[PDB]
Amino acid sequence: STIEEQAKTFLDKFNHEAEDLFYQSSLASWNYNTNITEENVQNMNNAGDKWSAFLKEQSTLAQMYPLQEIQNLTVKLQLQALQQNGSSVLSEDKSKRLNTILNTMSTIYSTGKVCNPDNPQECLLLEPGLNEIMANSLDYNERLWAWESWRSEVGKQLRPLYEEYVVLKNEMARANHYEDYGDYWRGDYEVNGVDGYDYSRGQLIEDVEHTFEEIKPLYEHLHAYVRAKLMNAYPSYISPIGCLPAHLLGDMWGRFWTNLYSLTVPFGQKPNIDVTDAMVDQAWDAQRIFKEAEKFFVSVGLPNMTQGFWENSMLTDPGNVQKAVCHPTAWDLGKGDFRILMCTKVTMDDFLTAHHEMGHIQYDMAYAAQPFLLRNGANEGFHEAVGEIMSLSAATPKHLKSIGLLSPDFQEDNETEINFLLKQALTIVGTLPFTYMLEKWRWMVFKGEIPKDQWMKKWWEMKREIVGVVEPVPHDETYCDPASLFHVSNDYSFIRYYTRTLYQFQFQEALCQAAKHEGPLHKCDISNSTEAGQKLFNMLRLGKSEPWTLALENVVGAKNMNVRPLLNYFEPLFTWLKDQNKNSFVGWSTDWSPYA
Amino acid sequence: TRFASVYAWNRKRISNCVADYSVLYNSASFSTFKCYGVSPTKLNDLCFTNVYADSFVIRGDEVRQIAPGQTGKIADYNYKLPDDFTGCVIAWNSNNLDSKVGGNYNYLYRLFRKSNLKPFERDISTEIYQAGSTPCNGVEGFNCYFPLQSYGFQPTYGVGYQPYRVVVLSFELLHAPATVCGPKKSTNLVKNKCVNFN
Numbered sequence A: 001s002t003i004e005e006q007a008k009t010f011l012d013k014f015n016h017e018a019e020d021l022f023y024q025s026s027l028a029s030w031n032y033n034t035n036i037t038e039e040n041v042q043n044m045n046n047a048g049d050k051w052s053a054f055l056k057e058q059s060t061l062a063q064m065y066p067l068q069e070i071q072n073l074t075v076k077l078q079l080q081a082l083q084q085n086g087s088s089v090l091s092e093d094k095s096k097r098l099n100t101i102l103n104t105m106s107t108i109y110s111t112g113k114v115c116n117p118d119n120p121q122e123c124l125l126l127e128p129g130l131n132e133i134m135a136n137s138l139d140y141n142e143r144l145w146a147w148e149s150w151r152s153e154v155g156k157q158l159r160p161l162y163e164e165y166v167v168l169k170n171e172m173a174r175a176n177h178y179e180d181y182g183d184y185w186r187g188d189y190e191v192n193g194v195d196g197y198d199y200s201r202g203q204l205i206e207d208v209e210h211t212f213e214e215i216k217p218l219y220e221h222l223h224a225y226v227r228a229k230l231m232n233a234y235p236s237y238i239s240p241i242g243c244l245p246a247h248l249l250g251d252m253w254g255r256f257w258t259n260l261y262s263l264t265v266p267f268g269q270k271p272n273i274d275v276t277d278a279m280v281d282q283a284w285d286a287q288r289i290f291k292e293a294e295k296f297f298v299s300v301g302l303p304n305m306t307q308g309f310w311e312n313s314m315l316t317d318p319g320n321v322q323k324a325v326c327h328p329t330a331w332d333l334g335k336g337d338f339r340i341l342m343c344t345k346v347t348m349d350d351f352l353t354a355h356h357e358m359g360h361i362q363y364d365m366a367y368a369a370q371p372f373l374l375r376n377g378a379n380e381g382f383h384e385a386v387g388e389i390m391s392l393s394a395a396t397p398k399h400l401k402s403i404g405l406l407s408p409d410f411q412e413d414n415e416t417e418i419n420f421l422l423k424q425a426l427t428i429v430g431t432l433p434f435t436y437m438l439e440k441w442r443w444m445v446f447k448g449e450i451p452k453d454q455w456m457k458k459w460w461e462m463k464r465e466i467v468g469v470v471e472p473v474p475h476d477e478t479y480c481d482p483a484s485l486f487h488v489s490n491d492y493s494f495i496r497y498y499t500r501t502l503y504q505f506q507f508q509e510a511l512c513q514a515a516k517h518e519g520p521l522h523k524c525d526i527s528n529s530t531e532a533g534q535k536l537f538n539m540l541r542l543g544k545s546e547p548w549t550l551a552l553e554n555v556v557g558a559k560n561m562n563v564r565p566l567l568n569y570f571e572p573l574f575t576w577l578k579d580q581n582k583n584s585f586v587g588w589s590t591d592w593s594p595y596a
Numbered sequence B: 001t002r003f004a005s006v007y008a009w010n011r012k013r014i015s016n017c018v019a020d021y022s023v024l025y026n027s028a029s030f031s032t033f034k035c036y037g038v039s040p041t042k043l044n045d046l047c048f049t050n051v052y053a054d055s056f057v058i059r060g061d062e063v064r065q066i067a068p069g070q071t072g073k074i075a076d077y078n079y080k081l082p083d084d085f086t087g088c089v090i091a092w093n094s095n096n097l098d099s100k101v102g103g104n105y106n107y108l109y110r111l112f113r114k115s116n117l118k119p120f121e122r123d124i125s126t127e128i129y130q131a132g133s134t135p136c137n138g139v140e141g142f143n144c145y146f147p148l149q150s151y152g153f154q155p156t157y158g159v160g161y162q163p164y165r166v167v168v169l170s171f172e173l174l175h176a177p178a179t180v181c182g183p184k185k186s187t188n189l190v191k192n193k194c195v196n197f198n
C-alpha cells in the first residue's frame, strides 16, 4: 500500500502518548526534586523505566519507512529523530560494559579524597573544602599544592577507564555511518533543507578557527593587564619572559576568572553598584522580586504568565524539614504547565538568576504549540542566550533608576562604567579560550590522528600556544588532568558554551539597533519598547520547526558566524587597555616555566 | 452529574413545555455563549416544535472547533455541525467535576475514521482502523490502531488543557402546529378606561 500517507497515522498516534508520558515523567522529577525523601524515589524510577521502555518500542518501527521519498520537510525531520539507532547497535556484553564504565566514571568523579600528609586524618573534597582553599586565599605554597594534590589522585584511576571508553564510543559511533564520534556531537549543527541555507559538518571545524583569531588581540591585552596587576602583589614568581602561571587563575581548571576581579581592580576608591541593601531597606520579599521584574517582560509586549505558576511552583523559603533542592531550574512539565525550582533570596545576583529562570520559562512557552518531537529550539545554544539577554540588559543604571530603587541624583562617571565593563569581560572572554581548547582537543582525540603515547604532550604544548598557561609542576604521560572535569567524564559536549557568547551579543546588538538607542552598547535597554518585542517573537515561537541558520535572519542582519559585537561592545575597554601596556611587552614564549 | 462522550453524544428531545431563555443568558458562569441564528435576547419570541440537546466533554481551547463550517478532529469525524446551524452552543468551565487527581481516563474520543461525518450522524461502533492493505486478522498488530483514545484529566492542566463541558441546542424552524413557546407578558390591569385588550 501507500507508504507516505501511513506515516502520518504513526506520528499522530506516537506523540499523543509521548506528550502525556513525558508529562508524568516531568511531574515525578519535580516531586523528587521538591521532596528529598525516600518516599518519592520509587515513583520517579518507575516512570523513567516505563518511558525508556516506551521510547524503544516506537523507535524500532521507524526504520521500515524509507526516509528518502517523503516529500514534506516537517514529517521527515520529525521521523529522522526516531530513525536514530542510539546506543542499541552494540553487543549486549559490550553495551553492558560500556554502561558500567560510564556509570563508574561519574561515581568516581565525585569521590575525590586528598588528605594533608602531616595530618593524615584530614581529607578535602571537590565540594566545599578543598574548593575554598584556592577560591579565597593569599598564599603561594598552598595553591600549587592543592592543584597538584587534586590532579595527582583523581586522574590515575579515570585514565584506564577513559582509555577503553574512548575506543568503545568511537566504535559505537562507527556503526551509525559516521567517520568518528565527532559527527555524533556535530549532528545538530547541520541542515540539508532549503537551498542557500544548507550546512555541513565539515564547515564548523573550519568556521570555529576563523572566528577566534579576530578576538585574540583582546585576549592578549587582557592577559597583559592581569599579568601586570599580578606583578604588583605577588613576589618574584611571575616573569614577563613567559606568561601568567597556572595555579593563580582563581580556579582548579581556570575556566572563570571571577575570583581575580578583586586582585585586578584598576581603582579601589570607587565601589561597585550594589542595590541589595536598597531592596532590604524597603522590605522586599522574594515574591516582589518576581512581580517587579516580570513587568519588564510586559512593557516589551511579551505575553503574561499563565495562572497556576504562582500557585504550583514554590518561590522561596524551604525553611523546616520540608527540604528541597536549591538549584535554580525552570521546568516545562507539558500540558501547558510550567514551574520554577529556586531558593530565591534578597540578592541582585538572585535578581539576575530569577530573570534567567523566567526567561527560560518564556522561551519554553514561546513554542508551546509545536509538536512533542519539535518542543525544542533549533539548536541547544539558543536557550542560554535567551536566558542571558535580559541578565545582561537588566543591570544598567537606567533600568534600576526607572523602577525606583536608586535616587535620581546618581552621578556615574567614566570609571564607574570601566569597572562594570571589566567585570563582565573577565567572565565572558575569560572562558572562551578554554572552550576552543577542550572542545577542539576532544574532537582531535576522537578523530584518532594521534597515537596512544602522544596524548598528554600535545595538550600542554597547545595550551601555552593559545591560552598561555605554563606547567607549574612537571607531569608525565600517566597523569590525566582533564578527566577531573564535569563535561569530560559524563559524555557532555563542550560546544554549547562557545556559540552562546556570539548569540548573546548578536541578539543584543540586533535588538539595540531598532530600539532608538544612540551611543555605546553597555547602556542599551529594550524596556518600554514594543518594537523590540515583535522582532524577537518571530523566532522564539519557531522552535525546532525551522533550521537555526534560517532562524538567524529575522532578528539579526546576517546568518554567518561573524563575531562583530564583541569587537564593538568592549570598545571603551579596548581604548583604555591600549593605553596601559605602553611599555610592557605583550605576548609569551612557550619555553619558560616556574621550575625551569 | 455525568455527560456523554464527544464521540458518542447524548440526544435530548425537549418539547411540550414553556421555554425559558432568560436565566441561561443571565448566568455569569458561562465561558462561551456566542451562537449563530436568532438573537439571544429575541429567543422568547418564536414558537417551535422540537428542541434537541447534545452534550460533549472536550479539552479546553478545542471548544472553538464547534462552529458552522470549521474543520479539525472533533468537527470533522467526531461531531459534524450543520452548516445552516439554527441553534446555540454553550460552554463553561468543568475543571471541578471532570478532572480527577492522577488522571481521569473515562472520556474516550474517536481519533481514526475513514470518511468525514455528515451533519448529525453517530459512529458508536468500535473497530480497529486499517491504514493500508494489512488486515490485523487477530487482536493487534501492524497497521492496526484503535480509534478511541481516552482523554487525560487532572485538576492542574493550566487553561488550554482543562475539561470544558459543552451543550448544543438545535431549534427546528419547520412550519407545523408548534407548541414550544415562552412567557409572553404579565401586564397589569385597569378598569373603566377605554383601552386595547389582548
Ligand SMILES: *[C@@H]1O[C@H](CO)[C@@H](O)[C@H](O)[C@H]1NC(C)=O
Binding pocket: A035, A036, A037, A039, A040, A321, A322, A323
Ligand atoms: C514529602 O516528604 C515528606 C517528608 O519529608 C512526607 O511526609 C510526604 O508524604 C512527602 N510527600 C508529599 C506529597 O508531601
